[PDB]
Amino acid sequence: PGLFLTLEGLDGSGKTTQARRLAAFLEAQGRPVLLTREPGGGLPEVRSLLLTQELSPEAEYLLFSADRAEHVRKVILPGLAAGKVVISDRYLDSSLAFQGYGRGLPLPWLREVAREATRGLKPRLTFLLDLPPEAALRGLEFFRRVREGYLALARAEPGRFVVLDATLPEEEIARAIQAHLRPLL
Amino acid sequence: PGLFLTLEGLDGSGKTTQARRLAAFLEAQGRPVLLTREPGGGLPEVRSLLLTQELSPEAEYLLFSADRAEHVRKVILPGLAAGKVVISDRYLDSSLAFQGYGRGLPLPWLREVAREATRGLKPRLTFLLDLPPEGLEFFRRVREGYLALARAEPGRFVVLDATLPEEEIARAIQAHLRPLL
Ligand SMILES: [Mg+2]
Ligand SMILES: [Mg+2]
Ligand SMILES: [Mg+2]
Ligand SMILES: [Mg+2]
Ligand SMILES: [Mg+2]
Ligand SMILES: [Mg+2]
Ligand SMILES: [Mg+2]
Ligand SMILES: [Mg+2]
């Protein structure tokens, strides 16, 4: 038991919708599931703080890392230990795309920080809902750096990333996630 | 140039009292000074997050580091660039002693996190007010941890007996500084 999955992409890429549909799919199959998300699954106040405040990228990354540290320890690892499929809407790859490719932080430092923040926990599969910023349902150069950063991450770890066309019908996307998922159960 | 100084120790060691007196002493010597402190110097709200019940040592450190990162960029480096004496009541060594020696986090990771957080900025001198720790086992660890950090960097740390009268401590800080004036 225990299966750790994540969803990634730009805000408005369909992640919550696809996390919900994946939950329901797994509920329909009798498989215990836990939905969670970042930011805020570890330290809710990190999410609400950063709604109205803009910090250096380093400080932003470090707040998200503290939230992720609590999130992994109090939510994700306990859920996995109970044998659940734990699905996180955003995880480490979010910081790497947004604070790294987006705001310019060096990836090897981000990962060194993450190593103890996440206790080395990595998803078995990560679904990237890929689209241009203009297609997001909810400046443009920044968001394009993020989109490309995600695609770069996916190219480096083709054993973990599944890249999906986020502009396809939500049902069609969900059925694609289910086919990629079927061999792992 | 600008001069970066820190004060360290357990809570109740007098390090805040000495930070305040040093600032006034330099400020009455005409030298422009910036008095600041951690936690709160970079992200004043960090104080709320740090009080979270059952916070993991990793998360606690990462919170202090977030404040520290903002502190260095927005307050300390600009102060130093203006040629001020910048005095910080607590800096990185507080995390090394409390979250490393106290809560058990590995020092090399703490330092690697710190290297971008702080942008490598080290105090020229750090005044450690050494107070006997009287849970107690945790404060013994922290107290001894601080002494170990001082032993490792004997040019940077000035270890002072925190039970001496306050004005004697102030005079001993002043004497260590006079060669940088
Ligand atoms: Mg991920
Ligand atoms: Mg992290
Ligand atoms: Mg730090
Ligand atoms: Mg210090
Ligand atoms: Mg500090
Ligand atoms: Mg190191
Ligand atoms: Mg001590
Ligand atoms: Mg040292």
Swiss-Prot record, chain A:
Family according to the record: Belongs to the thymidylate kinase family.
InterPro entries linked: P-loop_NTPase (IPR027417), Thymidylate_kin-like_dom (IPR039430), Thymidylate_kin_CS (IPR018095), Thymidylate_kinase (IPR018094)
Reactions the enzyme catalyzes: dTMP + ATP = dTDP + ADP
Underlying gene: tmk
Highest taxon above the source species: Bacteria
Keywords: ATP-binding, Kinase, Nucleotide biosynthesis, Nucleotide-binding, Transferase
Phylogenetic lineage: Bacteria, Thermotogati, Deinococcota, Deinococci, Thermales
HAMAP family according to UniProt: Thymidylate_kinase (MF_00165)
Summary of the function given for this chain in its UniProt record: Phosphorylation of dTMP to form dTDP in both de novo and salvage pathways of dTTP synthesis.
Keyword Kinase appears in the UniProt entry: yes
Residues where ATP binds: G9, L10, D11, G12, S13, G14, K15, T16
A cellular component annotation (GO) from this entry: cytosol
GO biological process: dTDP biosynthetic process; dTTP biosynthetic process; dUDP biosynthetic process
A single MF term (Gene Ontology): ATP binding
Claim: ATP-binding is one of the keywords in the record: yes
E.C. number(s) listed in UniProt: 2.7.4.9
Enzyme kind, highest EC tier: transferase
Protein name: Thymidylate kinase
